[PDB]
Symmetry: D2
Subunit: 283 residues, 4 copies
C-alpha cells in the first residue's frame, strides 16, 4: 500500500461545514476503523499511521486514515470552537458521505480528543474507542503546563524551520535513532506545502485555548469499550491523564509502553498493532 494508491477525497456537509474537502487514505473492506492524527505542523493520516494501516487491513478491517480539517490535504479552516469537537463533526460528515453506519475510532493526541468528542456527540455511530495520549483533558496533577512538547509545537507553527522541526521530533520520540532523514523531509514537505494551515492553526488556538477542549466532566457518558494507550515518556500529553480516563470511563483499560514518546503506534508498532487488533476482535 502507498499514499498515492489509497488517496481519496470527499466533500462533507455537517453543521458548520459546507462542501468542505476532506482528504483520507483508505484500504481494506471489512469493519471500518477510522484513524485520527495529532495536531503538530505537517501532521496527516498517512504519515501518522503508515506502520499501522497494513496490519489492520491484513486483519480484515477497512482502514480510513483521515486528514482533519486544517491539516495536510484537507481544506484550510479557522476554528472558533475547540478542535476536538469541530474535528468530530468532520468525522461524522465523512461517515455520512461514505454511508458508514458505525466506525471504530483510533486517535492520538489531538486525534484522541477528536475521538472522545465523537463518542460523546454521536454515541450511536461509534464501535470501539482507542485512545493514545489524548490531548486537552485539563490540568495534570504532576506536569507543569504547557507541556515541553506543546511549547515546541507552538514554536514550529509560528517560526517553521527544518531545525525546529528536528527539535520537535527529538522531543516527540523517545528513541532518537528513529529520526531518519525520510521522516524529517516528509514532515517538512507537508509544512512547506501548506503554509496557510500553520497560520490558521495559530489563529484558531487564540480563539479556543486548550482549556476549552476539556471534556473531563462528560466522560461518564461514554458507553464505548475503550482501550487507552500511553507512552511512559510522552512529553506532550501527561501520563496521569491515562489514569484520569481509566477512572472516569465506564469500560476502559490502560496500556503503557516503556521507552515511548507521543507516537506509540509508530515507536511500538508491532505491540500496538497486536494489542489493538486483539481488542477489536475480542473485547
Amino acid at each position: 500500500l502507498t499514499e498515492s494508491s489509497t488517496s481519496k477525497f470527499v466533500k462533507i456537509n455537517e453543521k458548520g461545514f459546507s462542501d468542505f474537502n476532506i482528504h483520507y487514505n483508505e484500504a481494506g473492506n471489512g469493519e471500518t476503523v477510522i484513524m485520527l492524527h495529532g495536531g503538530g505542523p505537517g501532521a496527516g493520516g498517512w504519515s501518522n499511521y503508515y506502520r499501522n494501516v497494513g496490519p489492520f487491513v491484513d486483519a480484515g478491517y477497512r482502514v480510513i486514515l483521515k486528514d482533519s480539517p486544517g491539516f495536510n490535504k484537507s481544506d484550510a479552516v479557522v476554528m472558533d470552537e475547540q478542535r476536538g469537537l469541530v474535528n468530530a463533526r468532520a468525522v461524522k460528515g465523512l461517515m455520512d458521505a461514505l454511508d458508514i453506519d458505525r466506525a471504530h475510532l483510533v486517535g492520538n493526541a489531538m486525534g484522541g480528543a477528536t475521538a472522545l468528542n465523537f463518542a460523546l456527540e454521536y454515541p450511536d455511530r461509534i464501535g470501539k474507542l482507542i485512545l493514545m495520549g489524548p490531548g486537552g483533558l485539563g490540568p495534570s496533577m504532576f506536569a507543569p503546563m504547557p507541556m515541553e512538547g506543546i511549547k515546541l509545537l507552538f514554536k514550529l507553527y509560528a517560526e517553521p524551520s527544518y531545525e525546529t522541526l528536528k527539535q520537535m521530533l527529538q522531543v516527540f520520540l523517545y528513541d532518537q535513532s528513529l529520526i531518519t532523514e525520510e521522516l524529517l523531509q516528509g514532515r517538512w514537505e507537508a509544512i512547506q506545502r501548506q503554509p496557510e494551515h500553520l497560520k490558521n492553526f495559530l489563529i484558531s488556538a487564540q480563539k479556543a485555548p486548550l482549556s476549552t477542549w476539556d471534556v473531563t466532566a462528560r466522560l461518564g457518558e461514554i458507553k464505548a469499550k475503550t482501550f487507552i494507550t500511553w507512552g511512559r515518556d510522552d512529553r506532550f500529553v501527561p501520563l496521569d491523564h491515562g489514569l484520569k480516563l481509566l477512572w472516569n470511563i465506564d469500560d476502559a483499560r490502560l496500556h503503557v509502553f516503556s521507552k515511548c514518546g507521543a507516537w506509540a503506534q509508530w515507536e511500538h508498532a508491532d505491540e500496538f498493532n497486536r494489542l489493538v487488533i486483539d481488542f477489536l476482535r475480542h473485547a
Copy 2:
C-alpha cells in the same frame, strides 16, 4: 482438568531446604510457565489460577501451579528471611528437581515478589516475567500503609473465621457478585485444613517485616521481558507500584484493568489470558 488429576509432589533441596515437600498442579507439555500465588490465608496454586490453567495449556504451554512453602499442600515452614527470596529459592529447587532449564514466571502479590526475586537471583533460569500487583516494593507515594487489604489479611491469619474470610474477599475483589459460596467454602477448607500454616505465617512476618521484601534498588538488574498488570481497584498493593516497576525495569509494559481488585487473573480472566498468551508468543 481438575485439581486431583493434575496434583503432584516433589521434594526439593536448595540452600536452606532439605527434602522439603512442594505440592504443585501440572498440565500441558510445551514451554514451562510457573504460576505463583499470593500470601493470603488458604491461598494455593490451583485455587488462584484455575481460570488460567486451561487456556494456557490450550495455547501450548506446560503449566505448573506451585504451592509456595508454608501454603496449601506444601510443607510447613517458619521463615526468618523475606518470603519473596525464600519462595524464589523454592522455585529453583522445584525446577532443578524436575529438570526444567528455563521457565516463564507469572506471579500476583506475594507471587509477584517471588518472581522478581527469582529473576534477580537466577537470571539464567527465567524466560519472560509476568507480574500482577507484586507485593513488598516499599512505600507508596499515595497510599497509607499497611494497605486496607493487608490489615484484613493479618486479621484473618490471627483470628480465622468464615465471616472474616468473607470480609477479606469483599476487599480482594472489585465485583462482589463473584463471591460465591464455592469460593468461600474452598478457601475456608484450605484454612481449616492447615492451621499450622497460619501460625507459622505470623511468626515469619515478625521475623521479616514487609520492608525487608523491598528489592526496588535491584530492579535495574532485570533483563527479562516483563509484563506488569494491575487492578485499578487493588486495595492490597498500591497502583503506583505499577509505575515504579515500569520506570525501573528495562523492558516492561503496564496493563491496568478497570473494575478489578487484587485477583486480575480471575476477575478479568479472558482479557488476562489473551494478553499474557500474546506476550509469551510475540514479545
Copy 3:
C-alpha cells in the same frame, strides 16, 4: 474555655431553612473565623476543634465552631441535595443572623466541602479559605473508592456501637495512642444522644451520593487566598485531591503533614495552629 461557657444557639432563615436551630461555640472578638467539622457519626464543632479554639482566640480572632445541620446540637434534617451546598447555605444563614459581613473559613472533610461551596456561592462573604482534606471532589487517580475510612463511617452510621466507633477512630488517626477513653466516650455520647441524626444522615446519603458533591469544575471561580492541608496518611479523603485543589484554585498552597490521618488540626495541632494563624495574618 469550655464547651458550656462558649455554647450558643441561633435560628437561621436562608433558602430552604426556616427557623432552623444552629448550635455553635464562640470565643474571642476579632476578625471572625468559622470552623466547620467533618461528617462522621457524633461529629461537632467543639470536639473537632477544641485544640484550635484557644490559640486562634489568643491570636486575636473571633472563633465560631459551628455544628452543621443534622449534627450534634443543631436541628435534625434530611437533605435531598449534596451536603456541602446545604451546609454552606446554613453558614450564610448564621452569618446573616449574627450580622457578620465576611468570615475566614476553616473546614476538614465534609467541612472542607462546606467551605468550598460557600466560597463558590457567596464570594463576597468570605475572607481566606483553609481546607483540610475536603471531601467529595470526585474520583482519586490512585485510591480505590469508597475509601477505607468512608466504609467504616457508613458502617457506624448504620450499626452504631462503641467497638465500631473505636475501629473508625483507629483508621481516622495515624497515632493510635491518641485514642483515649475521653475521646471515645465523648464521641459515643454524641452518637447516643442523637440517634435521629444517624438515621437522617443515611437517608440523605441515598438521596445525594458523594458524586453529587463534586464541585471540581467550578474551582477556577474561587478568588479567596487558599491554604490546603492534608494528612499524608489520610484514609478517608485521598492525598491526590490536595494536588487537584492546588492546580485548580488560583491562589493556593499545599501543606502535607507526615504521620497524620484525617484530623490534622488535632493530630498536629501546634504546627497547624502556627501555620494557619501565620496564613491569616500575613498571606
Copy 4:
C-alpha cells in the same frame, strides 16, 4: 547587606580537599544557617539567596551563603564522585575551619542533594534540614527524564550564550516578569568570569551521572527535622519527589507553592522566609 560587605574566603581540608578555596557570604551572629545553591551555570550563594539573607539575619540567625566547589568564587574542581556527596564534604570542611559545631541547612536542587548527603554523612553536625526541590533522587513516577530544565542546563553549560541563558531562566521561573535585565546580566557575568567551571562541570557529569546521586535507599537514616518545599511548576526536579521524601524521611513536612518554578526562595520569598523561620524557631 551587599555581596561585597559579606564576602569571605576560607581554605578547607576534608578528605579529598587540600587547601581548597571556598567563597561564602556571611551576615548575622546567631545560630548558623548554611544555604546551598543549585547547579546551573553561573549559580552562587549570594545570587541564589539574596532575597533570604536579610530576613533570616533579622530573625537572629548567622547566615552563610556558600559557593559549592566548582561554582562562582570557590576553587575549580573536576569531580569523579556524585556532587551531592563531594559538596557535603566541602560543607563539613567549611564548618570545621570556622569552628561551627552544628548548622541548619537550606538547599535547593543540587544544594538539596548536598544537604541530604550532609545529613546522612554527618548526622551529629546538622540541626534542622530544609530542602527545596532536591535533585538526584532517581526516576520520577510521572515525569520523563531528563527533565526539560535539565536539558537546558546542559545546553547552556556546553554552548553558553546570553540567549540560551534567558531560555533557561524562562523555564526556571514560573512568572516571566521576574526575568529582569539585572538577573540576566548578573548570571551572565558569573558565566563569563569562570569559563573553566563550565568545562569542569561537563567533565564531572560524564564521570558521575545523575543516577549516582540517588540516596533514596538511605533516607530512613535521617533523624533531622525536615521541611521540604516544592514549586508546583518546577520543570527541573519532579514534584513527586516531594512525596518520596515525605514518605521516606521520619519527621518531614511538605509545602508546595503554586505558580512557582525551581527557585521558590526567590519567587515566593516572603512566604518562604516566614515558613522556614517559623520552622527553625518552633518545630
